[PDB]
């Protein structure tokens, strides 16, 4: 329930040693959680939310002038005035002419203009400063079990059942123990500073759509600058990379001026990423966090429950994920109570003999009438194998075939394994969940190789990291010893490796 | 001395982190009973039950009986993460810091 | 005792501008911020802007960018509000009470607050009219 | 900007009543309302700060709760000095609020 389908779940498990497992949870992917004792849990991060935020420049990205004024000065009697300058709305620069004769001064050879309008504004461009704290992680969590066709999306009457959770963690409150009654306990602890590396983002508000900025690129951009200070008629800073003086042959300058620019910020911004919504709680997509998953108690509620004899029949056939796990639908009735089920499977119909992993481990019943239909899931072996639901002479089967290698598990898990390595950085040491010798050991070499590496290379872009990993390659070999070669061989590697992330 | 006090611990204001890495906790203690000590502590581990790091402040205390004493606690967390934990060992409020040095 | 006090009703032109004082007294004066507040004669109450004593620094509403302007005078203790582009919607009753927390400069928000938030010294209630 | 609705409009209530007011915002405001009862035209009366909180020269008939959004005013018994026209006020964000107010009416 609740994760199956979405391409990006993991499957966490800890031999017994107390419940450590500390998984990492990311946005768009769910994860679910499971162990020998333990009713399988499965947590999605789905929304995040950034409550109050701070007013940092806003922008000016379309402007329109008013009156343009000019007051040429001769070529004696110095540079030129025009009293309608000093006034911050009037935006000034000054060139020179040739002032001849037929023209007055004179003399001629080359007096002075200050050509200048006023820089009215339309459409600021509104960042806004967030800060780690006051932040709200909203993550939503299931078990498996009960439920037929949970499927997100009802949600609300699931949270008051006793299956479906939401737990709701600021950095002021990190510890939470949401109930579940009849289940237990599920104490997380949960990290909400490490996660999206907050207070170098941004939050910049266009006509209507919003989004996340690095600050250093939020800086740096050549727009009028709003200052962040407030009500006035605004003291738009630089105002003059939007008009434009162009001057005639010789004489009167005038001023272009350059109209929105809109969509050249928006091409400008590539490599950003959107946010929704915006009230006084701005809310937002993708951005990962890590919890202490504590599993104190969490009690079956089905160990002690009879298993029931009567015939399953399916009304899914059962479908395979993408991961190679199996979910099943199976309605029932004629038998009743909150029963059990047999959920097994085998290699042969003859002995009972129960062969791979089941991922729903005891699921029950809500002891209802006709056709009471839960949902479980499985894990089967690599090859040919048997789903067996039901209990005697009228058992339920499904023949399956598997058709993914043992092999091709791990390979396609060292994938996913590369892809967590990639996006999250340091944090993808101790996803692999345990407390061990070298998960703080990984995370100490990759915390300070991936430092430096993001201290040398910082951000090198696309194209830039293909081409010189390209170039590191070719000096990777080309040369003298084992020691330069290969280290130049490894980042090249690496860089064309960070190329061959997520680009689909 | 002064005796342990269990109580419930609300915030006063959202903590901070000086320049020079320390951090400031300005909590209320929800007024028990009279002048006695509030400890505090920098966790690696759970919730509870592993100090790290290293209290500035020594000996913080809350000194008057009624509803909201503000005590102001400077504190010095290990290089990596870390939770504060506030006096009970059971009914308390937590933090992360990410120390980032 | 702690008291802002302001200057009597004015009777303005249209597209001229008003000018209120606000005096404090019992207080230090460079230790609370000054707020504005409006009162139309029907609708309730409606939160001009801000200054503070201190450093003259100002902030105000979104329907008064650019109509409203606050200066200060340290050695009277005195707070001038300038409304400028008069309107007949600017017919209103005009209010100062202090915020308070008001160490530095300009509003604070997330720290403190209340304790006559601004709920004390409001001097008196400046009719301000405009008409011909 | 934090849109503040007070309810009700008007009230009307004899001497030695109770009656609550509530006050809601569009968004989270934490502990962060104020309550003001004016005369009219007149040096105001003190209510309450915090949206929790007597201040000092303060009849004690007044009270105010309220936790997220939600708030609730409580005069427990009304007196013919109390009628005033009761407003609530945003502290947070900025472009601070006031409700449009709650008139009393003596009975």
């Known amino acids: 329930i609740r994760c199956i389908g979405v391409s990006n779940r993991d499957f966490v498990e800890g031999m017994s040693g107390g419940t450590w497992v500390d998984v990492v949870l990311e946005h768009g992917g769910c994860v679910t959680v499971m162990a020998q004792d333990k009713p399988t849990v499965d947590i999605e991060l789905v929304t995040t939310t950034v409550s109050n935020m701070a007013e940092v420049r806003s922008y000016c990205y379309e402007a329109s002038i008013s009156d343009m004024a000019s007051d040429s000065r001769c070529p004696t009697q110095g540079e030129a005035y025009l009293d309608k300058q000093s006034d911050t709305q009037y935006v000034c620069k000054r060139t020179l002419v040739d002032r001849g004769w037929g023209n007055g001064c004179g003399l001629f050879g080359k007096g002075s203009l200050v050509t200048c309008a006023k820089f009215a504004c339309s459409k600021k461009m509104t960042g806004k400063s967030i800060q780690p704290e006051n932040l709200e992680y909203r993550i939503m969590l299931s078990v498996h079990g009960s439920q037929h066709s949970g499927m997100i999306v009802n949600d609300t009457g699931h949270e008051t059942d006793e299956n479906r959770a939401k737990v709701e963690i600021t950095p002021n409150s990190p510890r939470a123990e949401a109930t579940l009654g009849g289940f237990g306990s599920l104490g997380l602890d949960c990290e909400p500073r490490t996660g999206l590396d907050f207070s170098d983002l941004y939050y910049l508000t266009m006509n209507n759509k919003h989004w996340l900025v690095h600050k250093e690129w939020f800086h740096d951009i050549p727009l009028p600058w709003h200052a962040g200070a407030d009500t006035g008629t605004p003291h738009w800073n630089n105002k003059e990379a939007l008009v434009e003086f162009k001057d005639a042959h010789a004489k009167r300058q005038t001023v272009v001026v350059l109209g929105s620019q809109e969509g050249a910020v928006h091409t400008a911004l590539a490599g950003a990423l959107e946010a929704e919504m915006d009230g006084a709680k701005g809310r937002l997509s993708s951005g990962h966090l890590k919890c202490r998953l504590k599993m104190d108690k969490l009690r079956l509620k089905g160990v002690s429950y009879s298993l029931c004899t009567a015939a399953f029949t399916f009304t899914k056939i059962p479908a395979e994920t993408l991961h190679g796990t199996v979910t099943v639908e199976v309605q029932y009735a004629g038998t009743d109570g909150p029963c059990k089920v047999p959920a097994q499977m085998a290699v042969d119909m003859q002995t009972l003999t129960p062969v791979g992993r089941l991922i729903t481990a005891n699921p029950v019943i809500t002891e209802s009438t006709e056709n009471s239909k839960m949902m479980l899931e499985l894990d089967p072996p690599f090859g040919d194998s048997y789903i067996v639901i039901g209990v005697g002479e009228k058992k339920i089967t499904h023949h399956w075939h598997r058709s993914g290698s043992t092999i091709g598990k791990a390979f396609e898990a060292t994938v996913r394994g590369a892809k967590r390595m990639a996006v999250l950085g340091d944090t993808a040491w101790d996803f692999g969940s345990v407390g061990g010798a070298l998960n703080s050991l990984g995370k100490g070499i990759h915390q300070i190789f991936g430092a430096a590496f993001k201290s040398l290379f910082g951000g090198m872009s696309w194209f830039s990291q293909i081409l010189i990993g390209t170039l590191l390659m070719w000096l990777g070999l080309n040369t003298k010893n084992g020691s330069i070669s290969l280290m130049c061989l490894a980042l090249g590697g690496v860089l064309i490796f960070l190329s061959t992330a997520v680009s689909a | 001395s002064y005796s342990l006090c269990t109580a419930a611990f609300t915030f006063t204001k959202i903590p901070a982190e000086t320049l020079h890495g320390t951090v400031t906790v300005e909590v209320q203690y929800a007024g028990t009973d009279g002048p006695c000590k509030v400890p505090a502590q920098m966790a690696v581990d759970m919730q509870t039950l592993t100090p790290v790091g290293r209290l500035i402040t020594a000996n913080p205390v809350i000194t008057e009986s009624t509803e909201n004493s503000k005590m102001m606690l400077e504190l010095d967390p290990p290089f990596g993460d870390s939770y504060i934990v506030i006096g009970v060992g059971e009914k308390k409020i937590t933090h992360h810091w990410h120390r980032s040095g | 005792e702690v008291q802002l006090v302001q200057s009597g009703p004015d009777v303005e032109k249209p597209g001229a501008s008003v000018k209120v004082s606000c005096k404090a007294s019992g207080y230090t004066f460079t230790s609370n911020y000054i707020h504005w507040v409006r009162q139309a004669p029907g609708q309730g109450l409606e939160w001009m802007g801000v200054?503070?004593?201190?450093?003259?620094?100002?902030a105000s509403a979104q329907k008064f960018q650019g109509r409203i302007t606050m200066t200060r005078d340290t050695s009277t203790s005195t707070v001038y509000m300038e409304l400028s582009s008069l309107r007949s919607d600017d017919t209103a009753v005009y209010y100062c009470?202090?915020?308070?927390?008001?160490?530095?400069?300009?509003?604070?928000?997330?720290?403190?607050?209340?304790?006559?938030?601004?709920?004390?010294?409001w001097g008196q209630g400046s009719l301000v009219t405009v008409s011909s | 900007d934090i849109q503040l609705t007070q309810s009700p409009s008007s009230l009307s209530a004899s001497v030695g009543d109770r009656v609550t007011f509530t006050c809601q915002a569009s968004?989270?405001?934490?502990?962060?309302l104020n309550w003001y009862q004016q005369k009219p035209g007149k040096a105001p009366k003190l209510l309450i700060y915090?949206?929790?909180n007597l201040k000092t020269g303060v009849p004690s008939r007044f009270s105010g709760s309220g936790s997220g959004t939600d708030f609730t005013f409580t005069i427990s018994s009304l007196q013919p000095e109390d009628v005033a026209t009761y407003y609530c006020?945003?502290?947070?964000?900025?472009?601070?609020?006031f409700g449009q107010g709650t008139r009393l009416q003596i009975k």
């Open positions: 915090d949206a929790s």
């Open positions: 200054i503070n004593p201190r450093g003259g620094s100002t």
């Open positions: 006020q945003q502290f947070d964000d900025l472009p601070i609020t």
């Open positions: 009470a202090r915020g308070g927390r008001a160490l530095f400069y300009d509003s604070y928000t997330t720290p403190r607050d209340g304790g006559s938030w601004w709920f004390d010294p």
């Open positions: 968004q989270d405001i934490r502990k962060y």
